[PDB]
Amino acid sequence: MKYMITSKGDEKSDLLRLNMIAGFGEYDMEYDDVEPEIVISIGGDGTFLSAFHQYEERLDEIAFIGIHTGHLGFYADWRPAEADKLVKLLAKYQKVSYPLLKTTVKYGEATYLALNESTVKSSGGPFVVDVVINDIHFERFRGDGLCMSTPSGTTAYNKSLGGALMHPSIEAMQLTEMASINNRVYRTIGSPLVFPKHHVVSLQPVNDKDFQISVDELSILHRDVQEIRYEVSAKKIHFARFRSFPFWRRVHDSFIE
Amino acid sequence: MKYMITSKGDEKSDLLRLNMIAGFGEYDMEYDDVEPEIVISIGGDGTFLSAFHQYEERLDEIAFIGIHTGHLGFYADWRPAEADKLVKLLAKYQKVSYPLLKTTVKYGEATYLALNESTVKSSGGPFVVDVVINDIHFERFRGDGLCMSTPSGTTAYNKSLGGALMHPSIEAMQLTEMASINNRVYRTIGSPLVFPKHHVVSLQPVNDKDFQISVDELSILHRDVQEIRYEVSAKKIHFARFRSFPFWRRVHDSFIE
Amino acid sequence: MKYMITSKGDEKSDLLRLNMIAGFGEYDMEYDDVEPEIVISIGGDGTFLSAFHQYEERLDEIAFIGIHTGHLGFYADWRPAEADKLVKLLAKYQKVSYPLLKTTVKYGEATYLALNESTVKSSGGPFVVDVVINDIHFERFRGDGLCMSTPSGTTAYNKSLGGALMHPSIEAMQLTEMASINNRVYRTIGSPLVFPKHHVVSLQPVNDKDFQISVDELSILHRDVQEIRYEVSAKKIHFARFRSFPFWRRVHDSFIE
Amino acid sequence: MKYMITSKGDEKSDLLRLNMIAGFGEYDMEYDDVEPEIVISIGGDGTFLSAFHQYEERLDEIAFIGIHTGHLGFYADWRPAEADKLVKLLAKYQKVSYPLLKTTVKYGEATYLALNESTVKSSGGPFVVDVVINDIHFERFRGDGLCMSTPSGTTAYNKSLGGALMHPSIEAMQLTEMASINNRVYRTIGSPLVFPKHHVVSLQPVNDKDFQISVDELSILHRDVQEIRYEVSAKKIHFARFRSFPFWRRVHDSFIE
Numbered sequence A, B, C, D: 001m002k003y004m005i006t007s008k009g010d011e012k013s014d015l016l017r018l019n020m021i022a023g024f025g026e027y028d029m030e031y032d033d034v035e036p037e038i039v040i041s042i043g044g045d046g047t048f049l050s051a052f053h054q055y056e057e058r059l060d061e062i063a064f065i066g067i068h069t070g071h072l073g074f075y076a077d078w079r080p081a082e083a084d085k086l087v088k089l090l091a092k093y094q095k096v097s098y099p100l101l102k103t104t105v106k107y108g109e110a111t112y113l114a115l116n117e118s119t120v121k122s123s124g125g126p127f128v129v130d131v132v133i134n135d136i137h138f139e140r141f142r143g144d145g146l147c148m149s150t151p152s153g154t155t156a157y158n159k160s161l162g163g164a165l166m167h168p169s170i171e172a173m174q175l176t177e178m179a180s181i182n183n184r185v186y187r188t189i190g191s192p193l194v195f196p197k198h199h200v201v202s203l204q205p206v207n208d209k210d211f212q213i214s215v216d217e218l219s220i221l222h223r224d225v226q227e228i229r230y231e232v233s234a235k236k237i238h239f240a241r242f243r244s245f246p247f248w249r250r251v252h253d254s255f256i257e
């Protein structure tokens, strides 16, 4: 098949990349970074995220696989010394799909896909937005911001905000808070919220209408924002898996020992 | 159909019960607390939980409905003044099903069903158990205890422990911690964990083998425990719904205003 | 004595201000916003903070007092209807002093005073700084930022970050975290830290050297930062108190009912 | 001086004890476990706590020192290999004092001292008590229980409950919550509270009057309880220190690396 390889750009990763290409040359694998079926990322989860966003247009045609030159990542879960074993099995593997988050921003409209999360903060503060779930006004949020995470993203930013870790087989999204003000006056739920497919969470401005919005590593200031809509994407990311590496096992290795 | 009515036992609830029965007498509704198809609970969520456990043997034949004489509950979501409207619609409604938690306790075996959660604490402390997910040892927990919650239960005990609130349409279970010790020596994940169907969480003793185990309001001391197994039950609870009362709307009314 | 009055600037507060001045005219109270002994703030805690910073140069010569035209504040603790009673007692009161936080920023030096807190975030992220206590390297922080709060400030930003509320009679400062990354790799204490007088907390850059630093409402981007030093200030703020309004009672009224 | 030595009771500690005694025999140090001036604990913090409670009657006459045969403790901060160096310096050192917590229990009265904390839970639940600070009703607590920690105790149970770590030079006490219920109905402060000297926190029963009360390792069920009073003790514990081992350095070694 057609394949491409992105690299963290450090000496370690660039040289490992040139080796897999050479090993791939010993097969009928046409390198093609235009319309690849196999996308290999060498570096960290940050490198993988970039690889994902480079090709978010052809997710249903691509099977991703990540190699970590540094510490064990959640997407880059295969060790550098397994490279030669990878180049073989990719030539002759089953696919694993994770849910994605669809974010829509309306002005006075733009959509994005996130593998980890999409967050919202204010350009200077204070940050005030009304939270609306399925058209029902749920709360008015006062604080630093909000984070909407995918299943696979719960181990990332979501985790640092006190959110729960959920298995990627669960088609859902999770909203956590950032330093929410809670008075006898102002009131937020406090707890993280987990939404199923087809549930629409909408954030609506109260005073200011400029927000610092991010999707994964991308962080854009958006002006004249009228609404921000979160919902579990219809599109899914496909991973090529050559071995059994259980999510909970990945969680254990990352956080426990 | 056959129906039965349990009451919190206070003057308010007992008299509301006698009225619905009388109103039910004006129809072809045979009162039968042996094999009822309709189980009505009048009181609070505590009354409802009892009603559920009285008939956990015939869940697939019963449609539950709760009336709250006190404050708005999550299971007892219908106001007392709607009683007469209830007795009518029940005579001629669609069913809503929530996931349940199956708990298994092995000795040197007993199973239970929970509508809210099952917890584990130690009889005198210290509490130490090994946590095993799908046969893989995940962590060794040191602290006060652990809580495994259903979707509908996340608004209860789970919530006070920092757990996330998840929609009851999601077939899953959530594990939270109780005052976990975290040293450079001892290590727990800290974050709540959300498991999908068919995932098995097993708790295994390290030193002591006696534990205070609860399922909902039931709290039993269990001796010579070898293992405690948690997994999303195959059985589901069925609610009779005569109106639209969205879960998130119930959450808003309960915690926000 | 000499006195001055600042106002939130809304119709309510401006008119209450003109009334107290007039009532003050019936006494020997020279209005002087250059070298006042009595500084009265009418509005909210935000108005009070501004009043404090307008005169942070003569704290030992000023006795502050706040009136809240909106909701009960912690510094603006006196109701609008008590204005006439205030103008009287100020003419003929005991002083209450709260500890302040001294922040020092060195380049390749500037000091500030805070009544609530001083925070540090990164200009674009990621935020990485080494935390050094009394010259001993304590940890390397990875996350969104850090907050150092005064005793009276613990009810503010500090509170939303999970920090503890401490009585203002305690000469100390408290450091809380903002979404700290905690891996098997990266490690922070997680818990808030409370330092006594004469303890010096120093934040030192690791990669980037530009930080968004705030003291109370003031938020300045600082470039080429070498060090940020936190320590309990030698200066204290003085309040004029005409009645008994216990801190814990203020906390109760603000957060409980 | 007179001295005594308690041991964890394991082979390691018992043999280290017999060695220090022998080394002490080479000096004019009369072993006396009745009225010792020097109390040495060999084991862990648990052993030290026991040593403290064995002699809580003569705290102002005793200087404690702890040796850890296992992992680094906060009270047992001296390594086993430093034993011979200890026996020398104790013969010819300065004292360090930490604040203690005084707990009073009234019936229809008994006092205790705690080095770490005193907690309150219910015998079967539910746990409901009114919290009263300096005679002012602050809140009505609904949940699992409450914990009142000393400065040195904040690194213990207090820490697992989300409490802040405070320096032992600060004469104060800190109250944290255990799984508190927070509805639109029931309301607790949520945040930990830090009280200075002379502040009295009183817990008063609402329905049940039986509570599981602990002070450090001691856990007693108390019946017919009318009130539980917490306040910073007038008594302090005295440590013999032969080197400089900063509290924050102890915290770093224990939790960071």
Ligand SMILES: NC[C@H]1O[C@@H](n2cnc3c(N)ncnc32)[C@H](O)[C@@H]1O
Binding pocket: A045, A046, A049, A116, A117, A156, A157, A158, A160, A215, A216, A217, C142, C143, C144, C178, C179, C180, C181
């Ligand atoms: N490389 C981009 C990734 O960095 C993660 N991130 C950003 N801020 C974070 C934070 N404060 N804690 C944990 N993860 C964080 C966040 O998950 C984002 O997708």
Ligand SMILES: NC[C@H]1O[C@@H](n2cnc3c(N)ncnc32)[C@H](O)[C@@H]1O
Binding pocket: B045, B046, B049, B116, B117, B156, B157, B158, B160, B215, B216, B217, D142, D143, D144, D178, D179, D180, D181
């Ligand atoms: N009536 C029994 C119900 O009481 C709930 N519960 C017990 N302890 C709790 C607690 N500490 N916080 C919130 N909910 C709690 C818990 O959800 C259980 O199912």
Ligand SMILES: NC[C@H]1O[C@@H](n2cnc3c(N)ncnc32)[C@H](O)[C@@H]1O
Binding pocket: A142, A143, A144, A178, A179, A180, A181, C045, C046, C049, C116, C117, C156, C157, C158, C160, C215, C216, C217
């Ligand atoms: N008027 C300025 C004051 O606003 C407070 N503040 C800022 N962000 C906050 C936040 N996210 N939560 C609670 N308080 C906050 C913070 O205490 C600052 O001193």
Ligand SMILES: NC[C@H]1O[C@@H](n2cnc3c(N)ncnc32)[C@H](O)[C@@H]1O
Binding pocket: B142, B143, B144, B178, B179, B180, B181, D045, D046, D049, D116, D117, D156, D157, D158, D160, D215, D216, D217
């Ligand atoms: N040896 C007795 C000591 O054990 C500590 N402790 C009890 N439960 C704990 C817990 N759940 N987490 C951390 N520390 C705990 C608590 O500090 C007590 O003083």
